[PDB]
Design a protein around this ligand. Sequence first.
Ligand SMILES: CS(=O)(=O)N1CCC[C@H](NC(=O)[C@H](CCC2CCCCC2)NC(=O)c2ccc(CNC(=O)c3cnn(-c4ccccc4)c3N)cc2)C1
Length: 302
Amino acid sequence: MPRVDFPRSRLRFKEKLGEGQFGEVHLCEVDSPQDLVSLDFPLNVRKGHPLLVAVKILRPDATKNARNDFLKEVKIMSRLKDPNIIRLLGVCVQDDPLCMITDYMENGDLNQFLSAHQLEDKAAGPTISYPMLLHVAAQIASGMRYLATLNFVHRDLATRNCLVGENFTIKIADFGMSRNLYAGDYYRVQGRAVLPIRWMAWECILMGKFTTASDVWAFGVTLWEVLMLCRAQPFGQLTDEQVIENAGEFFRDQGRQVYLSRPPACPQGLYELMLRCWSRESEQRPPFSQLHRFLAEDALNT
Ligand SMILES: CS(=O)(=O)N1CCC[C@H](NC(=O)[C@H](CCC2CCCCC2)NC(=O)c2ccc(CNC(=O)c3cnn(-c4ccccc4)c3N)cc2)C1
């Protein structure tokens, strides 16, 4: 948790990024950021380039429940310091309105980004190479490796929750179901609670057991998305109820559970890596440290 508030007066509004029931998110430029690096604000300045940030701000009439949610979000983010996890650059909480300041990631979420690209075919819109797709996936695995060392379970890892900056940089975040774009990826259970069942390991669906090992299962599905260039939903031909049935077949283990198929042009050894992420026994799934090393090496030799 920061020792001091970010100085509100240094935030120069530029545009609205998004709007919600109890707050807004604004794109802002920071005046003279070099002054603030000396005070342990984690700002990365260049020379002739302005410093842009995203600022989430509570509305002055926000309910008590919304203020509670905001304060807990600040607490969680204050712990996480890694190049591939979204970063809390500062807060304004000594007075109202409450603010949190994060990285500005100009290329949007990774689903939006990959849906706008085509795979490069060097043997023959904007394109992306197979090595770069592996570099993207390696960055996701490195961020999850960090969360694993803190014993922090993400519970909703997917491309829609990864953000893209300059030079193909990736940072993991969590937007939940708060944007209306991805409602088809969530299954409603109890009341307002929803579950991203197509990314969830069998023990999450049947018993609600969420662990780092189930984050590895979700990473397998996320890797499948990346190699599909986000062109199709996992198990797209099957209903939500059929995906839940499949979790039951993993539990019964009588050889009738089904798997995501191998993406077009996906190397066989890489499909086998996904399959290991979907092992029935959580202790047989690979750890994030091993997934990172594997993908980083292939990114350089492919
Ligand atoms: C019931 S719940 O608990 O599960 N819940 C449901 C609802 C969500 C809750 N999310 C959390 O608490 C987690 C923090 C914890 C999380 C833990 C795992 C590791 C990642 C961090 N907040 C976040 O990630 C988070 C927080 C603040 C911002 C503001 N910045 C932008 O918006 C932002 C930047 N650039 N552009 C952008 C720029 C140009 C084009 C497009 C986009 C933005 N639009 C963004 C993300 C969780």
